[PDB]
Structures are given as C-alpha cells and as structure tokens.
Ligand binder design. Structure first.
Ligand code: MG
Length: 245
C-alpha cells in the first residue's frame, strides 16, 4: 500500500509464515542449497498462491541458512516448559514491552515483539522470542519439571549478526543462580555466579561446584548486569541441568 512499516494486517501472516518456514529449514540444514529451494517452493505451493521466482525462493533459502546456529546441548533441560516446567509469574521482574525493526527472510522489515517470561523456557530463540525487563537488573523464577540436583546451567542469546544494530548489548552479563528448597522458602541458596560472554558463542553452559548435594525444584535466574544496553535486558532461553533425585 504505502510501503510504510507498521503493525498492519500484512504484518501478521508475514510473521506467521516466516518462522513457519524457519522451523522447516532445520530439517534440511544437511541438504544442498539447490535441494532446499525446491522444497521451500512446495511449502509455498502448499499454502501460498503465487508461483515464486526461481531465485526468489533461493534467496529466502540463503537468508534462512543463517538463522540457524548449531545446538550441541544434549543434556536434559529440566526448565523446559513442554517438559513440565513453568515460570512462577508473581516471582519475576515486571515484563518490559519493547520492539525492534529487523529484516525477515523475505527482506521485508518487520516489528519484532518482546514476549512474556514464559518464552525463556521455550526452544524457539529467533530474534524477538525473548523476555525483556527494564534496566540491567532483573530476575525470573522457574519451577522445574522435576526435583533435581542442579549441576549446570545454559544461557543463550541471539547471534550478533541477527541482533539489533549487530551488537548484543541487551544480553545478560553477570548473573547468579539461586536454589529454593520448596515453593514456600523465599530464602534462596546461591548455587553460582557467572558471566555470559558477549564475544563468545550464542549458547553458553555454566556448571556449579560438584560437591554440594542440595536438591531443588525451584530455581532463580538473577541478572546482575547486561552488556551495556541502557534501556532493557532480554533473555532468549534459560536451561537448567542436573541429576534426578
Ligand atoms: Mg525463547
């Protein structure tokens, strides 16, 4: 219409179509760039109407080929929502509603919206699927899917290349992990203090001191600092690993 970027109706399906394509691409990360484009042309020919150009599909493929970053984490995630874990709503920082204009797979700029604390327990970590709170300090409390002996923690953020302004300044920096013996404790035990490295890999794993046998089902992620973003901090995914009791 105007060509203006705005929260229009065209914006709706275009976002819906985008990460619908993305969840399909991971299945063909081991396929040729030529083979991938042919398949993508058929999911388009499964719902979309127009027979897309031969290279236009190929370009979406080339673009989608770096919305993928390797996930080598094979450990059980006891903070995974679909596994039975949940974010304790009343025990989280106030959700900060923020948005960023970024380029989608189709080249069209889209407003990407920040979500509820729930998404930090969700595997989808595409740009925007993160929970933001105001300032460099915040916290989220998670009830794990099972009572475990915590042994490690995994924190990930979007890659720099897909991040707003190609910097990662909104990523958490120094953080602490707390364990709560029950849901009725509100006297946390400090499991460990770490720092998410902005210059490191998107996915980073941190392990605790391996001699304390304390058992937990409730865990707090407390962000102490971020990587310089003066307005907010957002978390893409928080994982909790350990041994089942
Ligand atoms: Mg997520």
């Amino acid at each position: 219409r105007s060509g203006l970027l705005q929260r229009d109706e065209m914006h709706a399906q275009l976002q819906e179509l985008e990460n619908k394509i993305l969840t399909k691409m991971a299945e063909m990360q081991g396929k040729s760039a030529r083979e991938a484009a042919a398949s993508l042309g058929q999911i388009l020919q499964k719902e979309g109407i127009v027979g897309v150009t031969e290279e236009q599909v190929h370009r979406i493929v080339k673009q989608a080929l770096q919305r993928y970053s390797e996930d080598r984490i094979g450990m059980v995630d006891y903070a995974l929502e679909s596994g039975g874990a949940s974010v304790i709503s009343t025990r989280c920082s106030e959700t900060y509603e923020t948005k960023t204009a970024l380029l989608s797979l189709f080249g069209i700029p889209l407003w990407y919206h920040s979500q509820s604390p729930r998404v930090i327990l969700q595997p989808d970590v595409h740009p925007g699927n993160c929970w933001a709170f105001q300032g460099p300090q915040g916290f989220a409390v998670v009830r794990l899917s099972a009572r475990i002996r915590p042994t490690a923690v995994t924190l990930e953020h979007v890659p720099k290349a897909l991040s707003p302004n190609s910097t990662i300044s909104s990523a958490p920096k120094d953080f602490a992990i707390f364990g709560f013996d029950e849901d009725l404790q509100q006297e946390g035990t400090l499991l460990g203090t770490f720092a998410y490295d902005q210059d490191g890999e998107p996915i980073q794993t941190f392990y605790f001191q391996a001699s304390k046998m304390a058992t937990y089902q409730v865990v707090e992620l407390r962000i102490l600092t971020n990587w310089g973003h003066p307005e907010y901090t957002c978390i893409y995914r928080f994982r909790v690993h350990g041994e089942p009791a």
